[PDB]
Ligand binder design. Structure first.
Ligand code: FAD
Ligand code: EPH
Ligand code: HEM
Ligand code: E23
Ligand code: SF4
Ligand code: F3S
Ligand code: FES
Lengths: 250, 129, 153, 616
């Protein structure tokens, strides 16, 4: 029978003088679903209920289950178990995050940084809120493709060595691509102020074009590109085009 | 039992409250722009140094390398010279040492170009071996 | 001076220190990839060339030894030519690679070729040309020197 | 608190919202905008909520694609409900839809666009123009295949503008009750194991559904009916729990939803004979019939030997006849999901699908203002002071016996908004935040402690699994008296096995063994009540189909003209809401019944819609 071994990072913050450990678990691939989350759930359920990880959705849309599997940041729920039973799969928390317990990192800086970009629509002229749709052309909303799909999982940011060293001052790929998402939205009027929040030497410019972010993104998005775009706008090599004018009959 | 204490709100970044009185910091964009233009400008310099030698090339190299390396190690120092791991004063000190690096780099190059063989000839002499 | 989020982030780091939480491992467990390894090579080649220029320029100045007696010393060791030419290759590769990959990184800054296929092609290409150029610069003159030694007039 | 000592922490808020999905966040935005000090208590980061998994769209008669009227959406909603929905609530829902969706776009939701630059809309299941006489509606507004994701991230981002205070990864244990008044909530903080009592003038329960009561669902692991369980433990009867939506197209293997929008855009269901069989079960609407009808159709095909795959136990959803540009533009999400979970390229091969538990139209009963109610025959509806409910955890009832596709994201925003509006209007800056009664929450803490140290021989994961398999077998698509009665017995026995619970993790910090065990208790309350409600309801209405009572049982036989008939009294027919009242200790359930509200909010604005025979 096909017995796959997983080596899983463990940490118990309630034991005095506790250190992180690596724990091997054996799992029968013929009695388990095809994804790594399935194995985590099977282990928790059938061997060790103290095994602790985040999860919710089953189809890679929630972002809860981000972790490092076989050296790469991904989502457990859509990462196929490697069926080569002669090799072990290592499972670690998202790199360089403070761990609360086992595979659960503290996510609150990531979230606070997201908050800081002011991820909401901003208008110069006050709008009557329920009254009418704002105009946006197909071509203009399609600029958001590649951008709006982000599930805020933090695989990209926890893959970035510059974010590893300077998370307190470097906003990281996830938050920067969202900041760009609000900057290139033709309906949003605050592009210049959004740019000025990350004008300093660290916020955006500590991207050293390492490219791990785009490489590891489980949704196949490209934070690297969006940061290059931010760099261009910040250096004034590029501008945000003006909105297309709203037709007379709209 | 529930003989309890009064809580405070969790730590939470308020993006509007934080924005009150926030005067934007100076823009690093123009510095970043020139750093990259300079590096692009050095692209022809490196092959030019392969084909043309002497004391004037030695001087062009010394100056361009020194500036480029100045900005270079400054970025490295800012990556790894982290207050979180070094404390505030040692972090400040490695920031200063980056300027000491640049200064010493140029002085030693000027020396080498003025009292030794110079950069381009130095390469010839190792390649002849 | 800091943005408010940077201030908030410092106070966050201090909270996490106070809580005595470990930091999930990173360098020791992340899969080596053409992304962060080439980046690392770019930084290492950059800094090695810098360091060599500093130690060289200041060292020779502070020492009685000059570069001419340094070169004559190693010729004196009479070590095999293939190994001498390897040292040359090693000296040349950082210059080649760092220059080439520098151009690549400036493109990345301008949002050029950041798709994964282009990232990988450019990496391989930059490592390849750099090796090809370092090879040429070492081999060609060695070729001339073999012709001078064993061909007529 | 018997064995351990717990750090208890007290807060004071104008309003507490339990839930940070679509409904909870929309409520929070409205309340923060109105200056109320607002606490959002959620057992996960808001953006992991199940709203984020929603795909197909959100209904509103914007008329981007063709002329439309909100009254046509009203009609389809009422018919959709199979006349078990409250028409005053359905009126409120559909009347406010254009404004609600326009708000979302105004908040920055990146809706797909038409060539005129308006919000693109698609067709969906069970919707029509001109009160069912016209053609197929197109009022399902969408962000491609990812409308839930996009709506939730938009709402969450906007909630940051309005100074609500977020208590993230706090697991709510109980409502804090004082003499039939809700004065707040008590929750466990996962990060540090502390227990928090939130005092509040008002409380909104917005906790989602309980799909995980079944073995196969489309729903998140977090859909454990915690809110309806909280209400039960507060002495409040739950409503219409027997009405479980099976969505026609969960992926056969793993339960992953494939949006109805795929049919909306022109996809169709195929059996093993290569027949587009929905043309037989629903000659007019076809594959865009209502969800109860399509799911029953598929299930009959399987029974009668026209099921597909090696075990002839599922159906094909065909999309490959559609242009690749349409598939990518309109359905990119399921295109990727079908590829990851079924090895299927939708440009070339069909998706293997099967009906799968998906949505709960039942829940905490409210009036049209989303104020929670208790009902007796003698006194009618009485509001529970302090307490509101919205989203899937509620039963307003806007969906009656069958929820219409794309009405639930609508429901959550519209009634989440309604909560903030109704609270601003009825709550005055004079009323003071209540003081907690002595010992408040102490029983919740005692239950926590006992589950945390549970010592028995049946581990929470086995017990959950038997619950789920039991529900799957006995309270399925087609139900019957003997199968249901046997199901009730097995389920009331499982409720007994809860006393034999075993847990292993003894920690207080991020103990998912503990939280999942609490969720099992919560799920048992929902499941037990669901099936006994289903056992007693001897009729076939919407999502509830009885083989031994195949007909819909109304006050009149609506298949014949009304002139001449004598009306059956309340106690004889079944056009009425089920109310299940459970004792959380013993598990004993009693049943009562509450009339459907047939009147609209305003007869001058819109006519009520009398029942007819329901056919698509
Ligand atoms: C796969 C899928 C696709 C769907 N697609 C569509 C669609 O396209 N269109 C449509 O109209 N409808 C759709 N629906 C239905 C619809 O998305 C949901 O019914 C609706 O979004 C639920 O919103 P909600 O805010 O009520 O609950 P949820 O979004 O489920 O949020 C529940 C919230 O309550 C919190 N909570 C729960 N228990 C506790 C506790 N004990 N303590 C603290 N907090 C707690 C959770 O943390 C969470 O934040 C879909 C459903 C599914 C399952
Ligand atoms: C660790 C290593 C430390 C190194 C020191 C760091 C300093 C670097 C600065 C040097 C700048 C270039 C020097 C060129 C040079 O010395 O002449 C050739 C010489 C030979 O003498 P020689 O024998 O005199 O050479 C023959 C004379 N004709 O040295 C070489 O051959 C080096 C080869 C340089 C490769 C060029 C890079 C390719 C760039 C491509 C750019 C692409 C598009 C534009
Ligand atoms: C010839 C063309 C060259 C180009 C186009 C170039 C380009 C660059 C660029 C773009 C960076 C920034 C890397 C980053 O921030 O991520 C960099 C860094 C650096 N370069 Fe160069 N460079 C060149 C030559 C040299 C040379 C000859 C040296 C010799 C000492 C040198 C030393 C450095 C150093 C030390 C850094 C450090 C910063 C880092 O790794 O980030 N460079 N270079
Ligand atoms: C040389 C080797 C040991 C292989 C290595 C490779 C890569 C790393 C991680 N990379 C880095 O630390 C790095 C590399 C280049 C530019 C910027 C950084 C930053 F500070 F921003 F992270 C660290 C160490
Ligand atoms: S970008 Fe890709 S990886 Fe980074 S957060 Fe958004 S989804 Fe996760
Ligand atoms: S990995 Fe990090 S340095 Fe820039 S390109 Fe991606 S953010
Ligand atoms: S559980 Fe949602 S992304 Fe994995």
């Amino acid at each position: 029978k096909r017995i796959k071994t997983f080596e899983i990072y463990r940490f118990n913050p309630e034991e005095p003088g506790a250190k992180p450990k690596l724990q091997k678990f054996d799992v029968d691939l013929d009695k388990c679903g095809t994804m790594v989350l399935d194995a985590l759930i099977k282990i928790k359920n059938e061997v060790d209920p103290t095994l602790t990880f985040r999860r919710s959705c089953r189809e890679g849309i929630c972002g809860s289950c981000a972790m490092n599997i076989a050296g790469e940041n991904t989502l457990a729920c859509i990462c196929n178990i490697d069926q080569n039973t002669s090799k072990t799969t290592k499972i670690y928390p998202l790199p360089h995050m403070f761990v609360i317990k086992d595979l659960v990192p503290d996510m609150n800086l990531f979230y606070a940084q997201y908050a800081s970009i002011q991820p909401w629509l901003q208008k110069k002229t006050k709008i009557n809120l329920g009254e009418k749709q704002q105009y946006q052309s197909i071509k203009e909303q399609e600029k958001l493709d590649g951008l709006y799909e982000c599930i805020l999982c933090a695989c990209c940011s926890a893959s970035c060595p510059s974010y590893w060293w300077n998370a307190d001052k470097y906003l990281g790929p996830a938050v920067l691509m969202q900041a760009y998402r609000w900057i290139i939205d033709s309906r949003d009027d605050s592009a210049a102020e959004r740019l000025a929040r990350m004008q300093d030497g660290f916020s955006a410019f500590k991207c050293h074009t390492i490219m791990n972010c785009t490489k590891t993104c489980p949704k196949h998005l490209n934070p690297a590109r969006a940061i290059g775009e931010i760099k261009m706008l910040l250096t004034k090599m590029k501008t945000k085009p003006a909105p297309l004018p709203t037709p007379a009959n709209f | 039992t529930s003989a309890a204490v009064t809580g405070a709100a969790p730590p939470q970044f308020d993006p509007i409250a934080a924005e009150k009185g926030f005067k934007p910091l100076h823009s690093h964009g123009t510095l970043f722009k020139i750093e990259r233009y300079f590096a692009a400008a050095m692209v022809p310099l490196i092959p030019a140094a392969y084909f043309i030698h002497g004391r004037e090339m030695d001087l062009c190299l010394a100056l361009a390398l020194t500036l480029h390396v100045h900005w270079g190690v400054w970025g490295v120092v800012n990556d790894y010279g982290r207050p979180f791991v070094l404390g505030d004063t040692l972090a400040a000190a490695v920031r200063v040492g980056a300027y000491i690096f640049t200064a010493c780099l140029l002085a030693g190059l000027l020396y080498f170009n003025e009292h030794d063989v110079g950069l381009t000839r130095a390469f010839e002499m190792v390649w002849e071996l | 001076e800091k943005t408010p989020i940077q201030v908030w982030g410092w106070d966050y780091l201090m909270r996490q220190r106070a809580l005595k939480r470990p930091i999930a491992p990173h360098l020791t467990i992340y899969k080596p990839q053409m992304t962060w390894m080439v980046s690392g090579l770019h930084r290492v080649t950059g800094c090695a060339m810098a360091g060599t220029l500093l130690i060289g320029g200041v060292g020779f100045s502070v020492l009685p030894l000059d570069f001419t007696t340094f070169v004559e010393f190693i010729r004196g060791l009479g070590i095999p030519w293939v190994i001498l030419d390897t040292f040359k290759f090693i000296i040349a590769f950082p210059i080649a690679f760092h220059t080439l990959n520098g151009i690549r990184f400036i493109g990345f800054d301008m949002a050029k070729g950041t798709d994964i296929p282009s990232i990988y092609r450019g990496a391989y290409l930059v490592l390849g040309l750099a090796a090809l150029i370092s090879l040429a610069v070492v081999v060609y003159p060695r070729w001339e020197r073999h012709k001078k030694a064993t061909l007529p007039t | 608190s018997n064995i351990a000592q717990y750090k208890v922490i007290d807060h004071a808020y104008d309003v507490v919202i339990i839930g940070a999905g679509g409904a909870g966040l929309r409520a929070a935005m409205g309340l923060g905008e109105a200056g109320f000090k607002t606490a959002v208590v959620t057992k996960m980061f808001p953006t992991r909520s199940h709203t984020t998994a929603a795909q197909g769209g959100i209904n509103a008669a914007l008329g981007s694609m063709n002329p439309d009227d909100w009254k046509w959406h009203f009609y389809d909603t009422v018919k959709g409900s199979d006349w078990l929905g409250d028409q005053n609530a359905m009126h409120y829902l559909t009347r406010n839809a254009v404004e609600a969706v326009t708000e979302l776009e105004n908040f920055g939701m990146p809706f797909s666009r038409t060539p005129e630059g308006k919000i693109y809309q698609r067709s969906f299941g069970g919707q029509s123009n001109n009160y069912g006489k016209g053609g197929v509606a197109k009022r399902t507004c969408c962000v491609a295949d990812r409308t839930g994701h996009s709506m939730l991230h938009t709402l969450y981002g906007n909630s940051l503008r309005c100074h609500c205070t977020f208590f993230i990864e706090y697991f709510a244990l109980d409502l804090l009750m004082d003499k039939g008044r809700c004065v707040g909530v008590i929750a466990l903080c996962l990060e540090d194991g502390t227990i928090h009592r939130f005092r509040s003038k008002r409380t909104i329960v917005a906790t989602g559904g309980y799909g995980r009561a079944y073995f196969s669902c489309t729903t998140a692991h977090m859909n454990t009916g915690d809110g309806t369980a909280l209400a039960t433990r507060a002495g409040i009867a739950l409503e219409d729990l027997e009405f479980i939506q099976f969505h026609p197209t969960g992926i056969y293997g793993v339960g992953c939803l494939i949006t109805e929008g795929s049919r909306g855009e022109g996809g169709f269901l195929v059996n093993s004979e290569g027949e587009r069989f929905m043309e037989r079960y629903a000659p007019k609407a076809k594959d865009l019939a209502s969800r109860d009808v399509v799911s029953r159709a598929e299930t009959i095909e399987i029974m009668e030997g026209r099921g597909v795959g090696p075990e002839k136990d599922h159906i094909y959803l065909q999309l490959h006849h559609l242009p690749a540009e349409q598939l990518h533009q309109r359905l990119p999400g399921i295109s990727e999901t079908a590829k990851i979970f079924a090895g299927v390229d939708v440009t070339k091969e069909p998706i293997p699908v099967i009906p799968t538990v998906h949505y709960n139209m039942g829940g905490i009963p409210t009036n049209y203002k989303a104020q929670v109610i208790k009902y007796t025959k003698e006194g009618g509806d009485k509001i529970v002071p302090g307490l509101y409910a919205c989203g899937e955890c509620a039963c307003h009832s806007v969906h009656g016996a069958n929820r219409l596709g794309a009405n639930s994201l609508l429901d959550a925003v519209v009634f989440g908004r309604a909560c903030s509006i109704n609270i601003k209007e009825e709550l005055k800056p004079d009323e003071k935040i209540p003081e907690l009664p002595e010992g408040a929450g102490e029983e919740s803490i005692a239950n926590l402690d006992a589950v945390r140290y549970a010592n028995g021989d049946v581990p929470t994961a086995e017990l959950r699994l038997t619950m789920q398999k039991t529900m799957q077998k006995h309270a399925g698509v087609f139900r019957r008296g003997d199968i249901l009665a046997e199901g009730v017995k097995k389920m009331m026995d499982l409720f007994k096995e809860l006393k034999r619970l075993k847990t292993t993790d003894r920690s207080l910090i991020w103990n998912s063994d503990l939280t999942e065990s609490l969720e099992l208790q919560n799920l048992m309350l929902n499941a037990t009540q669901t099936i006994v409600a289903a056992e007693n309801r001897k009729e076939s209405r919407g999502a509830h189909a009885r083989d031994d009572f195949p007909k819909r049982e109304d006050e009149y036989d609506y298949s014949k003209p009304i002139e001449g008939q004598t009306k059956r009294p309340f106690e004889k027919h079944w056009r009425k809401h089920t109310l299940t009242k459970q004792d959380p200790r013993t598990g004993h359930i009693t049943l009562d019944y509450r009339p459907v509200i047939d009147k609209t909010l305003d007869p001058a604005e819109v006519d009520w819609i009398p029942p007819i025979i329901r056919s698509y």
